[PDB]
Design a protein around this ligand. Structure first.
Ligand SMILES: NC(=O)c1ccc[n+]([C@@H]2O[C@H](COP(=O)([O-])OP(=O)(O)OC[C@H]3O[C@@H](n4cnc5c(N)ncnc54)[C@H](O)[C@@H]3O)[C@@H](O)[C@H]2O)c1
Ligand SMILES: NC(=O)c1ccc[n+]([C@@H]2O[C@H](COP(=O)([O-])OP(=O)(O)OC[C@H]3O[C@@H](n4cnc5c(N)ncnc54)[C@H](O)[C@@H]3O)[C@@H](O)[C@H]2O)c1
Ligand SMILES: C[C@](O)(CO)C(=O)O
Ligand SMILES: C[C@](O)(CO)C(=O)O
Ligand SMILES: [Mg+2]
Ligand SMILES: [Mg+2]
Lengths: 342, 342
């Protein structure tokens, strides 16, 4: 009955994906793969996976799975997606999708030629509060949107769980802004032009931890995407994205604690848009953790019905172009044309 | 000794300036001037002013005053400042200072040549909550500021009291953004480069009612100035400017209802930064109305002691440049160098 998955990269975040695969209806994990045998045993023993591999090439050679879930760091994404396409195995790939837009496009083209689905595991838009904002806007409750702010400002120690974040020359846009830019696209549509500024505040890291981005959307809306991992607040908001939308007939204000305020022609409503806390989830990650179940169930449903996923490889190019444009803009000082990159 | 003022432009907003001049210690109004004799009659009778002039030329010829308060619309500012300079009368001039940066510079030059003070009545930085943000940041409570947001988003019918606002090709940056940009300078210092976007949402007006501006400050800080008169919120925030500042050791958050959250190395504090309610004030103008008294007392103190004012003509050029740069940037789509304009 169930689709049989193979997960590659049994790291920090993969533990969440494994829990979710148990919960997903119509799919489960039949095999795992990791370069590190300490991680291979730890995850293998925790989830009771009999089939365990030290390298992906051997995994693919044995086969016996219907899809692959790639939860490695960015360095091995291109090779693993290319291995999947050559073996005709539908593939999920973690963010950041690739090291460059050029690599991403090549990965998309290879999967399109192999006639296999490719979904980027881009789960921020699958969060309950973000879904709620989308539903309000699509309902026409505030009319046509003309302005947005999408803000993730945190002082959370992401570096403990994910030490590589402190080492790269590139940090926040590639790691976190990739989500916030995707949310901006999800809510207000594709971007025409982009302008960005960056800064490093934290002395203990190599790369930028503050980014401010100004988006000119194709539909005429303007938005601000502002991200920071050097923001010291009284109440730590991690991992909440706060959202303001202004429209011709109203406003949406998603504020701290998942408070969703909507003003329209017929007054003003307030609702709790907080996530469900799953049995295996853990504060403060529970928002992200629920969205892992949401996107993996989405993948599983779309693989059966044969439709395109929401954050497909093809879709995600238009998010990834913004990340690369933001770095270009921050260095050059100039506004970047997004259409010309694609 | 009591300083004697002449006020020119007995319009909508000048009634507030007249109330405030009564409350000011060390100064009062001895003469008024307006081309419209209905306004001259109404304001003259209300405030008991015997000396009433149909034109400024005659007012200056008769003299008998130590300073002039110009509360007309922008069209007549340059001429009235020039008349003040030639008659060696210290001058206050309402915003917008001039029609262009070029006119503003000439006005500043003429007053410097005549050895008379020139202050722009730029009263937003003189609001109690804005003064509190400045005082917190100057104290060192949050370390060195690196990022800010300054936001004035409203659905208030400013067009009732000020109908001309609906008629101009230019609207919100010139009318309101001029204040918000001044606050950005006041808090985070002078600006090196600037990028702006504008649009018109309201179908009943000629000019732009939404503007979003990205500032690169000379000290390294980045800020967003976002203004709108087409924002429909459950609670109308007019005329509050909301302010976020991030620093190396903390944050300032000035939110709706004048609530001031400051978090630093010691902990979080919440303060009530609400304005006073003067005897002659009216909701919802009371915050602005208090600041009119503050700036007019400031003028009076500085004129009496021979100091320079905070929003002197010379200082205000660095605000006004940002307004002209924002219009330029919004039309061309290009980043504008502020230094090159001054
Ligand atoms: N919200 C989210 O969706 C979210 C949250 C955190 C991290 N992430 C992303 O997930 C990815 C993984 O992050 P992480 O913190 O778990 O990394 P990690 O370093 O903890 O784990 C990666 C694992 O993959 C293994 N690996 C690397 N290359 C391999 C290869 N070629 N074959 C087999 N195994 C290989 C490593 O041994 C390691 O155990 C990153 O790209 C990150 O951006 C996403
Ligand atoms: N926060 C603030 O400080 C604030 C608030 C509102 C308005 N304003 C500014 O105040 C100015 C006036 O606004 P308003 O709404 O009172 O305008 P208004 O049209 O109501 O008043 C202007 C008055 O000046 C008179 N006038 C014009 N040219 C003249 C001349 N050459 N000689 C004599 N009289 C002349 C007109 O007859 C009119 O009565 C504007 O520049 C506006 O931007 C500032
Ligand atoms: C945790 C993070 O890597 C962003 O910092 C994520 O993708 O959720
Ligand atoms: C009212 C206003 O003109 C801004 O819209 C002012 O200057 O206070
Ligand atoms: Mg399952
Ligand atoms: Mg007085």
């Amino acid at each position: 009955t169930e689709l049989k998955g193979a997960l590659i990269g049994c790291g920090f975040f993969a533990v969440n994906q494994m829990h979710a695969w148990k919960d997903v209806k119509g799919a489960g994990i039949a095999a795992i793969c990791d370069r590190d045998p300490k991680r291979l045993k730890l995850v293998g023993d925790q989830f009771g996976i009999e089939r365990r591999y030290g390298d992906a090439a051997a995994l693919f050679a044995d086969g016996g799975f219907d899809f692959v879930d790639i939860a490695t760091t960015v360095q091995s994404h291109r090779a693993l997606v290319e291995m999947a396409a050559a073996h005709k195995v539908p593939a999920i790939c973690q963010k950041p999708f690739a090291k460059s837009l050029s690599d991403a496009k090549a990965m998309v083209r290879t999967c399109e030629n192999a006639d296999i689905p490719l979904m980027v595991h881009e789960n921020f838009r699958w969060q309950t509060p973000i879904q709620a904002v989308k539903a309000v806007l699509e309902s026409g409750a505030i009319g046509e949107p003309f302005w947005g702010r999408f803000s993730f400002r945190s002082g959370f120690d992401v570096f403990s769980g994910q030490p590589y974040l402190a080492e790269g020359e590139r940090f926040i846009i590639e790691d976190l802004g990739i989500h916030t830019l995707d949310i901006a696209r999800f809510i207000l549509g594709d971007v025409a032009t982009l302008t960005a500024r960056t800064k490093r505040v934290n002395p203990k890291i190599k790369g930028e931890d503050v980014a401010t981005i100004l988006l000119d959307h194709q539909n005429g809306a303007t938005s601000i995407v502002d991200v920071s991992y050097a923001t010291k607040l009284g109440t730590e908001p991690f991992p909440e994205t706060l959202i303001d939308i202004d429209g011709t007939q109203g406003t949406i204000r998603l504020s701290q604690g998942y408070r969703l305020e909507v003003t329209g022609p017929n007054g003003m409503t307030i609702s709790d848009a907080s996530p469900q806390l799953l049995s295996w989830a853990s504060r403060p990650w529970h928002n992200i953790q629920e969205s892992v179940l949401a996107i993996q169930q989405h993948w599983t449903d779309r693989l059966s019905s044969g439709g395109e996923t929401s954050t497909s490889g093809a879709d995600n190019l238009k998010t990834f172009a913004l990340v690369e444009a933001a770095y270009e803009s921050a260095a050059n000082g100039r506004t970047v044309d997004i259409g010309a990159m694609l």
